[PDB]
Design a protein around this ligand. Structure first.
Ligand SMILES: OC[C@H]1O[C@@H](O[C@H]2[C@H](O)[C@@H](O)[C@@H](O)O[C@@H]2CO)[C@H](O)[C@@H](O)[C@H]1O
Ligand SMILES: OC[C@H]1O[C@@H](O[C@H]2[C@H](O)[C@@H](O)[C@@H](O)O[C@@H]2CO)[C@H](O)[C@@H](O)[C@H]1O
Lengths: 267, 274
């Protein structure tokens, strides 16, 4: 019997997650391992439910658990859990992202284009997300005149919110979106409103999904090298299973950075 | 005791060949939605890695599932043999001995997509096939239909990616600047084509019309928005899950005519056509 790894993701509809999955599955498969994916964005299921479903079939789990790191590691006992993008707590391992760095770099690009009227579009129902608070922190630190927009995390939801906001605030000449999915919605709002990109208003996303290269204009984004993210998660898993890495230690907590990828949506 | 989750649950395996063609995540999500709402556990095996085949995915899934729904890359027959009486429902291929099958009417889709272009009086139509003469099923169906109409059309072939399709379209548009209509194998490849047309200063639809296939949500985000022969993925999922219910209940006999369902694409007109 070969090593089996559970992969838990909150949906397949946000294109980040299938790209994340594909990367992890690619590298795990080349180690000769099996991977089973549980998409839990359905029927009110949670990150904890995903882990409970997978544990009897797997020797380990990697996933976005939506807060349930502690309880999930407990369900797993001595099988390692590697959580992404959350407080690791009692999890055996962790992969996080330097949002402060990302916030800094992304704002810088808009500042370099002397953008006077900036909006940040947040995923939600004041900023609520980790990346949200970083961007807001950096914008307030610089003294930029900026506004917060909030929308559910879909393209359509982001378009509608942006479209409305542009009517109330037509001067807006720079927009940072929570992610590339929402960013695609923003672009459409600008398109529909008759504004050119980047001339009348620039747009920067976050994630670096392939979708960005197919949009018109192609989308500038704070990208994550998904080969690096997967590699980080699999090697960390190797260490934890070999015992090279002690569960819960410093050496089991990794942080990765976004790289700015400039495309057509900025000048 | 009484607080617990009750009923030992049915377990379904979903085999997909990759997660990189946006069609499959959309397909998978739909199936996981419906299955989950029946109280089923689902596991997805993306087998587009390590040289693995659809048969490998079924071998992996079998011991931990009661049934498989999947795109199997031609291993339908061998996979059902592995599964024994555990039902396999295959999509878009010759099901062989598979317990159930869902396929699509590519002739109807060909006729509707082509009608659209004829109605806009496009004079120089190209079809972009996924590949390395038309080799795919829908590919043959479209050729058949255009040959039948006496239209003067060209064939383009590329690997099934956006970039490969872009690369191939651009090369073709140079030797064939007259090109005013393009049918793409699917929406992913179409997105490459839009890029090539844009990069060649050709307006869409005005100078060239583009129609894809699949109806992935991406079409609504491209500029121009992509007209396509669309599948309702709700309906495709519903047909798969319902068929499985019939097979597991015994209401549907494995291999019977009633275990083979044919679905149809619907034309969705967006920006990319006149
Ligand atoms: O890690 C990159 C992805 O983050 C996802 O959002 C996370 C969020 O950052 C985290 O704080 C927690 O709330 O889980 C979320 C996933 O449900 C984005 O959805 C995705 O687009 C990536 O940016
Ligand atoms: O079912 C629609 C999807 O088909 C996928 O291609 C299929 C192909 O049609 C089928 O004949 C067989 O060869 O398997 C292929 C997938 O492994 C497309 O890739 C996808 O975009 C949909 O159109």
């Amino acid at each position: 019997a070969r090593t089996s790894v559970g992969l838990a993701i909150p949906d397949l509809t946000n294109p980040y997650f299938p790209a994340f999955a594909s990367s992890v599955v690619e590298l795990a498969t080349l180690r000769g391992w099996h991977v089973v994916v549980d998409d839990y964005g359905h029927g009110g299921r949670s990150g904890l439910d995903a882990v409970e479903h997978l544990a009897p079939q797997v020797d380990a789990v990697i996933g976005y658990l939506g807060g349930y790191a502690d309880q999930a590691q407990t369900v797993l006992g001595r099988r390692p859990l590697i959580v992404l993008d959350e407080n690791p707590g009692g999890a055996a391992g962790s992969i996080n992202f330097d949002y402060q760095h990302a916030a800094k770099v992304a704002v810088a690009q808009l500042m370099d284009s002397k953008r006077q009227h900036i909006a940040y579009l947040e995923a939600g129902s004041v900023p609520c997300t980790v990346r949200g608070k970083a961007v807001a922190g950096r914008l307030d630190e610089l003294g930029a005149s900026w506004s917060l927009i909030v929308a559910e995390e879909t393209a359509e939801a982001a378009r509608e919110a942006a479209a409305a906001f542009l009517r109330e605030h037509p001067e807006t000449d720079g927009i940072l979106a929570f992610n590339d999915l929402m960013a695609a919605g923003v672009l459409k709002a600008l398109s529909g409103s008759g504004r050119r990109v980047p001339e009348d208003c620039a747009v920067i996303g976050m994630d670096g999904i392939p979708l960005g290269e197919l949009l018109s204009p192609q989308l500038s984004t704070m990208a994550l090298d998904l080969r690096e993210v997967g590699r980080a998660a699999v090697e960390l898993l190797v260490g934890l299973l070999s015992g090279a890495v002690t569960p819960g230690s410093q050496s089991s907590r990794t942080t990765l950075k976004h790289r700015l990828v400039l495309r057509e949506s900025t000048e």
